[PDB]
Design a protein around this ligand. Structure first.
Ligand SMILES: Nc1ncnc2c1ncn2[C@@H]1O[C@H](COS(=O)(=O)NC(=O)c2csc(/C=C/c3nc4ccc(O)cc4s3)n2)[C@@H](O)[C@H]1O
Length: 539
C-alpha cells in the first residue's frame, strides 16, 4: 500500500549473463563500421567498437587460455582511460569476477581492497604500478602484473597487447569467439569497494544477475537513455565506483560514444560538451559549485546538451537548479544508489525533474520508508529510514555475513541508513545520511540542511558542515567554507545568517573555518574525517 513499486520496463530483462549480453551488443556496433565506443578528450584520440570489441575478446580468450575461470578474480587499477574497460569486458565474457580499484587510492586503502579481492592477475597503469609493487609484498595470491597503457613489455611486465599474442593462437578470429555461459545468480560479476561506513571498505559482491537488470534500465527511454545510435556522453565520473561503472556498461550496451577525462578541467569540459556535440553529461555533485558561479557556460554553445545527470552524493535543491539554468536545462537528472544495490535504484524519470528529489523507483524495485524506531512502513510525506528491495541488491559482503545480516533484513529489505520521505507524486527525497547527523544537546542536526542554506548565500562558493566536539554540548555544528574570488564575510555574518533561517536547535554554534577547497572524497562525496580534522585543529 505505502510500498512504492517501480513501473514495468520498456526493455524487459534479456536472458544470458552480463558477459553474453555485453558481447552480443558490442558485436552489433562493431560490424557497423566507424562506430566510436570511447574518446579521450585530453589527447583527442578515438577508438571504435570494432577495435574495442576485438581487443576485449582477445583479452577474454587470452585469459581463458592463461587459466582463469569462475573460481578466479582480477584487479583493474587505473584512472579513467581508453584502456580501463578492455579488461573489464574481457573478464565478464568468461566468468572471472572484476574488482575495480582507485588510481588515487593510497597504500593501506589499496592493500585492503587487494586482500578482499584476492586477485590472480592485476591490471595497472604506469602511474599505479609502484603502489602495486609495494602492496604485492604481502599479496602472494597475485601471479601477474599487466601494464595497461603500454604496447611493449614494460619493466618485465607484459602489456595487454603482448599478453594477448603470447596466449592467442596465431590463426584466431575475434568474430568467432563465444563467451562462457554459467549461473548468473551464483557467478560473481563485480567486487566493488565501498566507503566502509567508518573503517576499512568491505567487499561488495555483485552477481551477473544484477548487471542484466542494470542494462534493462539503461535501454529504458523513461528510466535511462533512448537508444539513439552515435549519441555522445561526456563522463567525468570515476569508473571504479558504481556510477561510472554501470552507466558506462549501459552506454556500451546502447552503442554510445563515451567521451572521458582523466581529471576535471572547467576550461575543457564545456569545449568537450560543445565540439563533440554532447547529449548527456555525467558530473558528480561536487563539480556543481564550479558551474553555479557563471564564467564560460554560455561562451560555448551547449545547444546540443539535452541533460546533466548526477549522483553518488547529495545535491542541494537550490544549487542543482542554479546549474540547470546556466546550462539551459529543465533540471538535474539526479539519482540515488548504494554500491550494495549495484547502481541507482532511485532515478529521475525523463521529463519528471523535481528540484531536491532524486527520482522515482526504477523497474523491478520496491522502495519504502520505515519508522526509525518501530520499523513499520510509513505513508506519504513521512520522514524515516529508506528500505529498498529488488534484483540489483548485492549477494553479500565477501567473508562478512555479519555486516550482511545487519544491512539486509529477513524479508530481503536493504536498510539504506538514510532519512527519506516520498511525496504525493512518489518523488523520493533524501534528507540526510543517518550517521552524518551532528549530536547537539540531545538534538539531531542534519549537515545537508546547513549545507543547503550556506550554499544559497551569493558570496559562498562551497561549504561542508560537521560536528566540532565540545564537552558540554558534546557536538556543535560548524562549517568549512569557500568564497568566490574577491569576496569577504565575517564568521559572525555567516553564523547570524544561518541563525536567521533556522531554530536555536541547529544554529552554527561551532563557527566557520575558511578553506580553499572543501574536503572532497573524489567519488562526488564530501569527506568527514578531513573536515573534522580541519575544524578540530582550528579549535
Ligand atoms: N542521490 C543521492 N542523494 C543523497 N545521497 C546519496 C545520493 N546518492 C548516493 N548518496 C549517498 O551515498 C551513500 C552510499 O554510498 S555508495 O556505496 O558509494 N553509493 C553510491 O554513492 C552509489 C553507488 S552507485 C550509484 C549510482 C549513481 C548513479 N547512477 C545513475 C545513473 C543515471 C542517473 O541519471 C543518475 C545516476 S546516479 N551511487 C548513500 O547511502 C547516500 O548517503
Amino acid at each position: 500500500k505505502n510500498i512504492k513499486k517501480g513501473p514495468a520496463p520498456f526493455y524487459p530483462l534479456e536472458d544470458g549473463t552480463a558477459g553474453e549480453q555485453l558481447h552480443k551488443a558490442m558485436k552489433r556496433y562493431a560490424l557497423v563500421p566507424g562506430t566510436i565506443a570511447f574518446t579521450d578528450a585530453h589527447i583527442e584520440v578515438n577508438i571504435t567498437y570494432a577495435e574495442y570489441f576485438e581487443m576485449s575478446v582477445r583479452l577474454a580468450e587470452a585469459m581463458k587460455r592463461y587459466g582463469l575461470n569462475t573460481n578466479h578474480r582480477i584487479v583493474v587499477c587505473s584512472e579513467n582511460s581508453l584502456q580501463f574497460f578492455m579488461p573489464v569486458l574481457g573478464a565478464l565474457f568468461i566468468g572471472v569476477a572484476v574488482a575495480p580499484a582507485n588510481d588515487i587510492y593510497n597504500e593501506r586503502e589499496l592493500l585492503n581492497s587487494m586482500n578482499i579481492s584476492q586477485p590472480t592477475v592485476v591490471f595497472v597503469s604506469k602511474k599505479g604500478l609502484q603502489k602495486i609493487l609495494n602492496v604485492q609484498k604481502k599479496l602472494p595470491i597475485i601471479q601477474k602484473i599487466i601494464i595497461m597503457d603500454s604496447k611493449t613489455d614494460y619493466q618485465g611486465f607484459q602489456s595487454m597487447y603482448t599478453f594477448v599474442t603470447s596466449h592467442l593462437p596465431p590463426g584466431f578470429n575475434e568474430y568467432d569467439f563465444v563467451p562462457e555461459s554459467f549461473d548468473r545468480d551464483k557467478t560473481i560479476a563485480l567486487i566493488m569497494n565501498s566507503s566502509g561506513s567508518t573503517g576499512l571498505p568491505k567487499g561488495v559482491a555483485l552477481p551477473h544477475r544484477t548487471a542484466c537488470v542494470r542494462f534493462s534500465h539503461a535501454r529504458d527511454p523513461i528510466f535511462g537513455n533512448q537508444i539513439i545510435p552515435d549519441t555522445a556522453i561526456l563522463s567525468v565520473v570515476p569508473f571504479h565506483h558504481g556510477f561510472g561503472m554501470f552507466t558506462t556498461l549501459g552506454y556500451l550496451i546502447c552503442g554510445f560514444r563515451v567521451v572521458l577525462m582523466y581529471r576535471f578541467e572547467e576550461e575543457l569540459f564545456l569545449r568537450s560538451l560543445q565540439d563533440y556535440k554532447i547529449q548527456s553529461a555525467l558530473l558528480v555533485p561536487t563539480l556543481f559549485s564550479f558551474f553555479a558561479k557563471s564564467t564560460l557556460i554560455d561562451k560555448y554553445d551547449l545547444s546540443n546538451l539535452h541533460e546533466i545527470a548526477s549522483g553518488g552524493a547529495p545535491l542541494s535543491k537550490e544549487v542543482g537548479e542554479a546549474v540547470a539554468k546556466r546550462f539551459h536545462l529543465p533540471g538535474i537528472r539526479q539519482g540515488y544508489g548504494l554500491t550494495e544495490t549495484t547502481s541507482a535504484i532511485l532515478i529521475t524519470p525523463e521529463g519528471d525533474d523535481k528540484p531536491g528529489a532524486v527520482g522515482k523507483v526504477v523497474p523491478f524495485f520496491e522502495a519504502k520508508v520505515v519508522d526509525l524506531d518501530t520499523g513499520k512502513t510509513l505513508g506519504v510525506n513521512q520522514r524515516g529510514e529508506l528500505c529498498v528491495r529488488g534484483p540489483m541488491i548485492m549477494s553479500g559482503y565477501v567473508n562478512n555475513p555479519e555486516a550482511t545480516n545487519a544491512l539486509i533484513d529477513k524479508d530481503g529489505w536493504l536498510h539504506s541508513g538514510d532519512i527519506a520521505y516520498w511525496d504525493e507524486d512518489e518523488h523520493f527525497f533524501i534528507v540526510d545520511r543517518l550517521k552524518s547527523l551532528i549530536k547537539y544537546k540531545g538534538y539531531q542536526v542534519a549537515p545537508a540542511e546547513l549545507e543547503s542554506i550556506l550554499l544559497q548565500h551569493p558570496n559562498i562558493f562551497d561549504a561542508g558542515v560537521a560536528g566540532l566536539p565540545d564537552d558540554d554540548a558534546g557536538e556543535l555544528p560548524a562549517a568549512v567554507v569557500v568564497l568566490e574570488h574577491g569576496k569577504t564575510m565575517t564568521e559572525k555574518e555567516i553564523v547570524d545568517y544561518v541563525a536567521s533561517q533556522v531554530t536555536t536547535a541547529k544554529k552554527l554554534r561551532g563557527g566557520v573555518v575558511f578553506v580553499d577547497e572543501v574536503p572532497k572524497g573524489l567519488t562526488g562525496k564530501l569527506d568527514a574525517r578531513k573536515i573534522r580534522e580541519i575544524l578540530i585543529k582550528a579549535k
